[model samples]
Target: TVVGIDLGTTYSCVGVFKNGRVEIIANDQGNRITPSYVAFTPEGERLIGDAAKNQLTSNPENTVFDAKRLIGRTWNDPSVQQDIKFLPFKVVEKKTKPYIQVDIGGGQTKTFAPEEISAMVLTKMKETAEAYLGKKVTHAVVTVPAYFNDAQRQATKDAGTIAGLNVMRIINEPTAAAIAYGLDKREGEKNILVFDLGGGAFDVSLLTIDNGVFEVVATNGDTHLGGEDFDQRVMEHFIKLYKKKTGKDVRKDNRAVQKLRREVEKAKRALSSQHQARIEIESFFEGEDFSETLTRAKFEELNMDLFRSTMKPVQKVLEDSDLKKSDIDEIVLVGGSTRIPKIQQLVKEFFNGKEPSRGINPDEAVAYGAAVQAGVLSGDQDTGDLVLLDVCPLTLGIETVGGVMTKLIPRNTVVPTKKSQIFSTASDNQPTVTIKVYEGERPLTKDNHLLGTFDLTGIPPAPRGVPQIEVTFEIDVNGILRVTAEDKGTGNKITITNDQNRLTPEEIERMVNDAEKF
Candidate 1:
């Protein structure tokens, strides 16, 4: 049997695709969703999910969660480094896995590849599924954020490989949610917006459902922001108060900061239902004493700025979707973060006081949707060959003669969409013309993240721009981009390889091998 898995930053969940129904497996905690956490025991046993999450408050250094943020990304990425400061673990920048490496123990650091950690979570989820269905499992369909880049998508595939399960397909979380909703709805054309605020990453997607077929019109998100950031913001606020009284920074006191962070997270969650959050801060810090009444209004006052952050993408998505706020048939809130009252209130205001759908569980819907897609793909569901159309999160283009990145494809462009931009040789009879690929909203190539580069050789002796070279870029359904170039007249072709990403992979392998010695 094959199952669908949601490998989220803060938690992970798996569901079996059987009998045309999606059944989510429960962890030892008896909850269908499991934390995406891992812990090392003194006896060398590797524990996962709830076991690992429980250890986070007690032995945080040995437990790891939210590793999804580091997957397929590098230290060179300014965003990751900035986030490292708030993460509890010693996430040192290394050339090891394509993602961030964690210190798991053995007098040495046991670096886990992004996919490997995901596999660990999958292994646990698979166990629950096997127990539930009373059978063994084989292949699966996994879900990821709609805005994940090409390298990120490939890294997700890598994780599926490490888990020892055959991945049948990669589906976007939002798309799957739409399918699950469409499967049970009034079948005419309807536009629904999915607001997904998971523990570690956030995404908002506009989708259209008609006759059981789902199409993702547009997607926008901050891969770096999510519920974790909300927790951090609160932690920082309390720590600032601690500093004013103690004349020192709570961050400098690692143990105290970690303790406070853990407690405050609980208090923040409590605020969702209660009017006030009473925080006890003395036990965590030495000689530090303070108690804060984190009122819902105060918490909202602090997070309102961040809560409003979701709207930038919302406006952009609404614009690109070609639908007015009134045109949306319904709004669905997905992910644990959406439980916040501030978010709930603000979302309503942003969309003309429109109410969000309560038909689906915010936290469970993404995983449920993933499982539904798996069932459909495996022929378990009656919806045969449901073709899903998705899109790229950003634009891809080439640098012009003056170093400007001319946009060939704009943001939110449909997947399986092709665009070709013509370029010229610098000099006559140039043997090879070099082309650089970039992804960003920036107009200059120097400002964007370098996707890859390629050189087209054997250019016939002709003046610059006279050779008719067309550079074509395509992002597949899985979010991986492929670059190809052809001389319009000669029928010559070449594919570019990613250089830095390739180099990083080699370095991470060597480091992980060295760590095994300790």
Candidate 2:
């Protein structure tokens, strides 16, 4: 049977379409949502989900959570560098890529790529589904943040492959929610703005559903912004309170900090409903206890900037789609972080007081939609006729003279599409022109993400602007990129299919084999 998986940063859920409905499969612990955590004990035992989370304080260095943040990221990424500072586990650079290093007893240490860690979590999800369904599941449609770039999406697919599942498609989290939202509404067309705020990422997408066809018009988000940032702010506030109270910084102690982190996360959740929440940690630091009460108003104040920043992407999506607030017929809220009252209030106030749609459960919506898509892909007759047309979330282009980024396919272009642009050499008698591909909104190449680079050689060696080179960028239905730079004159060309940081097929195969051994 095919399944749908929400491979979230903080938590994950699995669902399968059966008995003419989507059923969320509970894990062995009887929880529908599983913590996206993997841990290795000093005695050489592997644990996942609740078990892994339970041992976090005692095995902070070996218990790796939030692997999604490090997946598909390079060591030089500013975000990666900043995140590593607070991470309890060690992150080392291997060939300029981030890898998790953990102690595995006997003074032995083992390193894992971010994809491998995520694969363990996916494997657990697969096993959970199998146990519940009493059958083997090999195919899946996994969901990612709509704002995830090429490398991040590819890395997620590789993670699924390592977990022994055939990833049929990488559906956007918001779009998947829309699929679930639109399944029963096969009547009139409606405009939907999906506001998804999860643990580690935020994505706002504008889509139009017409007669079982869901087409995304515009999508924008900050991959680094989400509920975890708010948790960090609250953690800092309490840490300061603890420092002022006990005259000791808990940051110096990893165990104490981990304990504090868990408490603050709970307190943060409590503030969503209660007026105030108490954060109490036993023996927090230096054998001293830390206790504090955080009010809802105080939590809002601490993350006011972040709460306000979410509107930027919302507005940007509206502008990109050329629609007014009222033009949005319905606003759908997805992801667990959308449970925050303040966030809900802000979203409500933004659309002229129009209430956001809450008919579907925020936590299970994405996985439900993903399962629906999996059903569609698996040719399940009960899934009905549905066509999903997602768009590229970022502008992809190549660097030209003066270091400017030439737009080949602007953001929001429909997938399975291709665009070509012609260019000439910058210098006379230049036989080779380096094509540097980047993706971002910036005008300069340095400000954008360098997806890949290749040299179009064997040019006719004519004066500048004489030899014509055609550069074409194609994004497949899965949102993966392929670039072809051809010297139209000499017929010399080069094509790059994969992004620079993605693991090779052989490497993925080796990792898959190694995973089976464990």
lDDT of 2 by residue, 155-244 (tens): 899999899999999999999999988886877889999999999999999999988989999999999988778888887787787678
Candidate 1 per-residue lDDT over residues 110-229, each given as its tens digit:
655555667677777777787887888778788888877777787787666655567787888777777666675656789989988888778889998876667888888888778888
Best by TM-score: 2
| Ten contiguous residues with the weakest lDDT in model 1 | 509-518
Candidates' lDDT values, in order? Answer: 0.75, 0.88
The runs of at least 3 residues in candidate 2 whose Cα sits more than 4 Å from the true structure, single-residue gaps closed, are 422-432, 457-469, 485-487, 490-501
Q: How accurate is candidate 2 locally (lDDT)?
A: 0.88
List candidate 1 segments past 4 Å from native. Answer: 96-106, 287-290, 381-385, 421-432, 457-471, 485-495, 500-518
Residue 396, model 2: Cα distance from true site in angstroms: 0.9
Give the Å error, residue 4, model 2: 0.7
Q: Against the hidden reference, what TM-scores do the models get?
A: 0.89, 0.95
- TM-score, cand. 1: 0.89
